[PDB]
Amino acid sequence: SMEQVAMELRLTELTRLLRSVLDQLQDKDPARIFAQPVSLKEVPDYLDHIKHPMDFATMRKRLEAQGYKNLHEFEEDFDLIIDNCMKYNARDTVFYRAAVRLRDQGGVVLRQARREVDSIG
Numbered sequence: 001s002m003e004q005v006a007m008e009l010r011l012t013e014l015t016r017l018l019r020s021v022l023d024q025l026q027d028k029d030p031a032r033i034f035a036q037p038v039s040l041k042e043v044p045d046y047l048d049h050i051k052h053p054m055d056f057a058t059m060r061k062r063l064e065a066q067g068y069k070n071l072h073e074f075e076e077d078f079d080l081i082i083d084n085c086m087k088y089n090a091r092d093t094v095f096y097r098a099a100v101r102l103r104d105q106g107g108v109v110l111r112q113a114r115r116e117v118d119s120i121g
Contacts, residue, residue, distance in 0.1 A: 014117070015066050018074050021113045022063060025078060026056050028105040033098045034081050049088050054080035071117045075110060082106075 029035065037055045038046050046053065059077050068074045085099035 011066050011069070013120070014068070014070070015063060017113070017116060018063055018068055018071070021074070021109060022056070022059060024109045025102070025106045028102050029056070029098065031098060033095060034085070034102065046088070050084045052080055053084060056081070071114060078106065
């Protein structure tokens with residue numbers, strides 16, 4: 001149907017916007033601390049601590065399969081990246097501090113993305 005097609009075009013346009021958001025969020029992580037999943041070879045106990053791991057590569061895979069239906073879903077995954085890190089790592093670590101900085105800087109990007117997604121519908 002043409003209605004299905006139109007919905008598919010909206011999904012595609014959202015996907016384009018979210019890819020630009022994701023690039024912008026990831027530039028706020030110049031150390032690439034959140035680039036890839038936590039390695040179970042190097043933190044074998046990780047899953048005893050963190051129930052839903054997340055990282056930028058995993059988000060990017062979801063994005064390219066047009067797997068985010070709205071901005072809320074994408075933000076949930078971004079928040080997992082930060083929140084997981086702040087639970088697993090202590091306050092005095094480079095990891096926790098990088099999460100705090102990503103959160104603060106990403107909030108600005110997400111504030112306007114919310115306006116763009118509403119605005120362009």
